[PDB]
Structure formats: structure tokens, C-alpha cells
């Protein structure tokens, strides 16, 4: 078997392969997560250099891991499929042995553990992917939003963004998001998410994807027209 | 799982004041057929140990090779191989006892009963038994097979407990062994008249006696025995 230690330390105390995997994430399309009072919303950028696409069949950016948890990402698309598959299997395996679906923290911890294992295993390179994992624990109404990254570290966020120009949209969220009073309704949370993506995206046509997750396995993806209504409303209020 | 084919019968032994005696006949039986008559079942290891083996002869020959190889291995990188770091009876025994139990534990035993007789470096007598099951025990007298049933009773009349060992000379002890070998020739259907005897003494060392024969037998009274009850002729 191929044994080579690809991820190793450098004189200055860095693991370059892990850090170069972050650069791949930085290249990826932007993804944003915002959690409200009774919901979480996952926004995702889709680059508009690709026309003549078939949006019916093209892999969606947001993936369901179980009926109550979702996972979006930024970075290498092919790499993300491997993590999603592993997470989906672990989700079913957990239901089988514990007789209870995974918590959002547990699922995140698992995915993060897989990412870490690839940073000190021989013959493999790190995943060029950072994820945003969101959902609601079983029989719980408190919204959950977590982030992972190639190194394997993970943490919880009131709101967070990853991918290209994420430092711009993070700057937007940092002043617009209030900890003491988060988005009270679904509309308020979605609007803030769309607003934040409009700082970076370009046009609010078929570039923005929105997915809303609510308690008790209530997940739904918004259509073009539904998203476009938020874009139209925000731009009219902007001109002031 | 085995079955023994070519087999060796009783091995008998005892302690005396200065050392140990061990004996075994020179027969290799093939069931009821007394097939081989030149078989040596006492195997010396160095000049201070004799391993007496009963049971399957193919497995005995394997054990011979192991002991032969053990001497070779001990000599490697060992300047004191013929002195302080020479092979002791206790070392040789424990090795065999380890093998016997490992083989029974893999359900593929060496089909034997073994008696390791010798004298230690400090002058102490060594005499211990081990068999196909890995079972081990020591006693002033030890015997295998029919020996256990017929020899031990006779040898225990000489050395019944530990305190009788210093009181027993090599002359008395050898006489009891040779007597026991005669009784076994009378009564064991898979025994032979010819046998080998080994004495390991702390003073005079190893004395290995070959081509001995059972003698001074009582058969004359047979002529007077007629029929099985009534018959007078």
C-alpha cells in the first residue's frame, strides 16, 4: 500500500498540506449559515459562468444527511461527496444502535474526525473542504449551526460563512447580527441570509440557493421566484 | 487429533542418596506385533540429564531432535556452555513441559509420557514427569504406563517418602529397578527382556548401561500346573 506521509510539519510549525487545503476552500463558491430564533437558514452561491446548465439534475449544494440535519460546503466538490456519504452512513448506524437520530453536534464531531484522520494518515491528502452543518436535535427546538474545516477543528456559530469572499460577508454578519435578539421569524432569517450573499454574489437570479430548516424534520428548499422576491424587496429598500 | 502407531511401554525411575536411576526397555511395539527390538528410549542430554520417553516413537524421535537442537542452541554465544551456563535438568524439563501443554492446547498432542531424570548443578536430585496432556508431577519414584501400576508399588517399599532418600544407596536402588523390570516382563504383554538403564550420580556422573537382560526368572513351577480346575494329567 501507498504509505507516504504527505501531511507533515515544516520548520515553522505548520502543516502545509492542511493549509493548502484551506486555499482550495477559499477558492470554492461562497456558503453562508444564519440561525434565527426558531430556524436555521443555509445560503449558497452558484457561479454564473456556467450557462446551459440543467438545474434539475445538477448536484445541489445543500445535502440532507438525515431528515433533520443538513450539510452545505465550500471547496472541492468531489471531496465533499465522500464526507457526505460517510456522514449519511453514520447517521443510519447511530439510529440502529442508539435507537435515536444523531445530534447536530455528534454528526459534526464525526465529520470533523474524518477530516482530521486524513491529516495524519499515510498515503492520503487532507479534504479540500469546509462544511456548515445545521439542524435540530431530536425532540428539541433550539437551532444548531456548526462549522468544520480540513484540519479537523469544529465549533458552533450564531452565524457563519465560508468560501470565496467569505471575509466580506463575515464582516457584514458581524455588525448586522445581534446576539441578544436573533431573527425572530423565518422571513427575517432568510432576508438577512440573502442580504449577506448580495454583498458578494453579483446578481440575485439563479446564483443564490436558499434552504430553510425548521424543527421536527421540517426542511424545504426555496424556488427561484421565492428567492427573487427577497432580492426585489431588498434592492428597493436599499435605494434610500 | 492423533492415534499412536509404533509405541514404547513403561519407563521407570527413582531417587537415591547421591542421584537418580532411570530405566526403559528397548522395544518398539506395533499394536500386538513386537515390531522393533533395537529401540533406545533413554536419551541423554549433556552429562547430567536423561530423558526417558514412552508412547509414540515417531513423536519420541521428534523430541530427540528438539533436545539435540536445544544443546546446539545453548552453546551459541555461550563461553560457559560446558560449565555454569550448561543445560540443567530443570531447564530441559520445563522446556518439554511447555511444548507438551502447547501441543495439547492446539488439539495436536505429542502422544508421550516423559520422565526427566537428572542431577542439578548444586547436587540436588531432579526427577519429574510430564505427558501428552501437559500434566506434571514429581515424586521419589516415578513410572509410566504399566510401570505406574506395578513398579511404583515395589519402588515405594524402598523409598516411601522424602526422608528415605538419604538412607537408600545406589546398590539397593539399582537392585529394585532391575527387579521391577523383571516383574514388568512377567506381566506386561508389550514389554521385552532387553532394556537400558541409566544412573546419574552427583559424584561419579552419568553411567549409561546398554543391552541389559532380565535374568534370575522363576518359571519352574509352571510344570506342576495342569488344566484349569479338575484335570489331573
Amino acid at each position: 500500500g501507498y504509505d507516504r506521509a504527505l501531511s507533515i510539519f515544516s520548520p515553522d510549525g505548520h502543516i502545509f498540506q492542511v493549509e493548502y487545503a484551506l486555499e482550495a476552500v477559499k477558492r470554492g463558491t461562497c456558503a453562508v449559515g444564519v440561525k434565527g430564533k426558531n430556524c436555521v437558514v443555509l445560503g449558497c452561491e452558484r457561479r454564473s459562468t456556467l450557462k446551459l446548465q440543467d438545474t434539475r439534475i445538477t448536484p445541489s449544494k445543500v445535502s440532507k444527511i438525515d431528515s433533520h440535519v443538513v450539510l452545505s460546503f465550500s471547496g472541492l466538490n468531489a471531496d465533499s461527496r465522500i464526507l457526505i456519504e460517510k456522514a449519511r452512513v453514520e447517521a443510519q448506524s447511530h439510529r440502529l444502535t442508539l435507537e435515536d437520530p444523531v445530534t447536530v453536534e455528534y454528526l459534526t464531531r464525526y465529520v470533523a474526525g474524518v477530516q482530521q484522520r486524513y491529516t495524519q494518515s499515510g498515503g492520503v491528502r487532507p479534504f479540500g473542504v469546509s462544511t456548515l452543518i445545521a439542524g435540530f436535535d431530536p425532540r428539541d427546538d433550539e437551532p444548531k449551526l456548526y462549522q468544520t474545516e480540513p484540519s479537523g477543528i469544529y465549533s458552533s456559530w450564531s452565524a457563519q460563512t465560508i468560501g470565496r469572499n467569505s471575509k466580506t460577508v463575515r464582516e457584514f454578519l458581524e455588525k448586522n447580527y445581534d446576539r441578544k435578539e436573533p431573527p425572530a421569524t423565518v422571513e427575517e432569517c432568510v432576508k438577512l441570509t440573502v442580504r449577506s450573499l448580495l454583498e458578494v454574489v453579483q446578481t440575485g437570479a439563479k446564483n443564490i440557493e436558499i434552504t430553510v430548516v425548521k424543527p421536527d424534520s421540517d426542511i424545504v428548499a426555496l424556488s427561484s421566484e421565492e428567492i427573487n422576491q427577497y432580492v426585489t424587496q431588498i434592492e428597493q429598500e436599499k435605494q434610500e | 487429533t492423533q492415534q499412536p502407531i509404533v509405541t514404547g511401554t513403561s519407563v521407570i525411575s527413582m531417587k537415591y542418596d547421591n542421584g537418580v536411576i532411570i530405566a526403559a526397555d528397548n522395544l518398539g511395539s506395533y499394536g500386538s506385533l513386537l515390531r522393533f527390538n533395537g529401540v533406545e528410549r533413554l536419551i541423554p542430554v549433556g552429562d547430567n540429564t536423561v530423558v526417558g520417553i514412552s508412547g509414540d516413537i515417531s513423536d519420541m524421535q521428534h523430541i530427540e531432535r528438539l533436545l539435540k537442537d536445544l544443546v546446539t542452541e545453548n552453546a551459541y554465544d555461550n563461553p560457559l556452555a560446558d560449565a555454569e551456563e550448561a543445560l540443567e535438568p530443570s531447564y530441559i524439563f520445563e522446556y518439554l513441559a511447555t511444548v507438551m501443554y502447547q501441543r495439547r492446547s492446539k488439539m495436536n498432542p505429542l502422544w508421550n509420557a516423559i520422565i526427566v531424570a537428572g542431577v542439578q548443578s548444586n547436587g540436588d536430585q531432579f526427577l519429574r514427569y510430564v505427558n501428552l496432556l501437559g500434566v506434571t508431577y514429581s515424586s521419589p519414584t516415578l513410572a509410566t504406563g504399566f510401570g505406574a501400576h506395578m513398579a511404583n508399588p515395589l519402588l515405594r517399599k524402598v523409598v516411601d517418602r522424602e526422608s528415605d532418600i538419604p538412607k537408600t544407596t545406589v546398590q539397593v536402588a539399582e537392585e529394585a529397578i532391575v527387579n521391577a523390570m523383571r516383574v514388568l516382563y512377567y506381566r506386561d504383554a508389550r514389554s521385552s527382556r532387553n532394556f537400558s538403564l541409566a544412573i546419574i550420580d552427583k559424584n561419579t556422573g552419568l553411567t549409561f548401561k546398554k543391552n541389559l537382560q532380565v535374568e534370575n526368572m522363576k518359571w519352574d513351577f509352571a510344570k506342576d500346573i495342569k488344566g484349569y480346575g479338575t484335570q489331573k494329567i
Binding site: - | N78, L80, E84, E85, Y91, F93, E94, Y95
Partner: protein, 231 residues
């Protein structure tokens, strides 16, 4: 230079640089001394600390009731090798009912260290060991080096500034060899020997480490207030 990338490469003059670099790790290690008479064998070790708040790194390891060693260099490598010695001593007891000879103990360590110097991927051990013991041929003292070379000696010392203690023992050879049936005097000679390798620092109560084995003495280690006698 170009021939020190791994252990599998010889230099043009016939040297193994990775083995020599492993040897260098021993010289950085704290000093330890070994010496014997005809009845007893003694290990004296100067323990090292990270700072005043830290403990003092333990240098002496027990292998059996009749054998043990002191280390100098990479401590984890000494743990691997001492563990191997424990198993080999233990194998000799269970299988042959026989206490392992100190000479065979050295031969086994040599052969284990050697395999690491001839194969790709692995590395040499980065530690030197002083093995003492009492077997059927009396008291013994061995010096192990991770090149594989094992040497039986009357006395020796390895580590930083070990040349001072090694010169002392070379002068004292005729005196300490005849310290028979006297443990405390043989230790004193060892404590005086290691003192020739000291600079600025002196031997304190939680700094000094002593071990002894002999005729009617199992391998025992002395630390703390138990070594206050010899200061």
C-alpha cells in the same frame, strides 16, 4: 551531507550518519555511571529536570529481579528496549525456568538495534543503556550503544561529560573491583565517580538516583530520602 537522509545509506568513507546522529543524542543526555565488584553491581544516575517546578526525569529501569539498566538519551526508546528485555527475561523464566544471562541480554539488544540500522523506513534507537545484573557467573556490567555494539566492562559511564567519570574509574579499577560483600562502599565509589562529571551543580536529595544488584540482593532502586546517606 548527501548520505545522511536515512539509515540505509553508506557514506563514501563507509559511515552510517543516521546511526552517528543517534549516538549524538546520547552525548546530550544526562550523565549515568556503572561499576561492579565480584559480589555486587551498581548503577548511579544523575537525573535531569525541566525547571524547579518540574520533577526529575527517571533514569533507571528494572528488567527482572536480577537485572536492570540506566538510560541516557531518548527516554521513550529506553522504554521500548527495557520492555523488550523484560519480555526476554520473562520468556527465559516461563519456558526454561532459567534466569536470563546478562551476556545473552546484551546479545538480544544488539540484534534488535541492528535490524533498525539496515532497513528502509525505520530509524536507529536514540538511546544508550548501561545494563547491570547478577547471574550464574557472578556480577556483570554491559554498555549498549544504538549502533548495536554491546560491551562487557568492569566500569563505565555514558552521557554528557561522561569522560570525567570514565577516567576516574580507569584509575580506581584496582580498588573498587575488590569491594566484595560491601554494598555501601561500592555505591560510595560510584557516587564519587559520577561527581567527576559535575559542573556548577552538585548532588542533591531529589537529583541523585542509585540502583544495586548482587549475590543476596535483588535489583532495587533508591530515590529521594533513601539516597541522602551518600551525599
Amino acid at each position: 551531507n548527501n548520505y545522511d537522509g536515512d539509515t540505509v545509506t553508506f557514506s563514501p568513507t563507509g559511515r552510517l550518519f543516521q546511526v552517528e546522529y543517534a549516538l549524538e543524542a546520547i552525548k546530550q543526555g544526562s550523565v549515568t555511571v556503572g561499576l561492579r565488584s565480584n559480589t555486587h553491581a551498581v548503577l548511579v544516575a544523575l537525573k535531569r529536570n525541566a525547571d524547579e517546578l518540574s520533577s526529575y526525569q527517571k533514569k533507571i529501569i528494572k528488567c527482572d529481579e536480577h537485572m536492570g539498566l540506566s538510560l541516557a538519551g531518548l527516554a521513550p526508546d529506553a522504554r521500548v528496549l527495557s520492555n523488550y528485555l523484560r519480555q526476554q527475561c520473562n520468556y527465559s523464566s516461563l519456558v526454561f525456568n532459567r534466569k536470563l544471562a546478562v551476556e545473552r541480554a546484551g546479545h538480544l539488544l544488539c540484534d534488535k538495534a541492528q535490524k533498525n540500522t539496515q532497513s528502509y523506513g525505520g530509524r536507529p534507537y536514540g538511546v544508550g543503556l548501561l545494563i547491570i545484573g547478577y547471574d550464574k557467573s557472578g556480577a556483570h556490567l554491559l554498555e549498549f550503544q544504538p549502533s548495536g555494539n554491546v560491551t562487557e566492562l568492569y566500569g563505565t559511564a555514558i552521557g554528557a561529560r561522561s569522560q570525567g567519570a570514565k577516567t576516574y574509574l580507569e584509575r580506581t579499577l584496582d580498588t573498587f573491583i575488590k569491594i566484595d560483600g560491601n554494598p555501601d562502599e561500592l555505591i560510595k565509589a560510584g557516587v564519587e565517580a559520577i561527581s567527576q562529571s559535575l559542573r556548577d551543580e552538585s548532588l542533591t536529595v531529589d537529583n541523585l538516583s542509585i540502583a544495586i544488584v548482587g549475590k543476596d540482593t535483588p535489583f532495587t532502586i533508591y530515590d529521594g530520602e533513601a539516597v541522602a546517606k551518600y551525599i
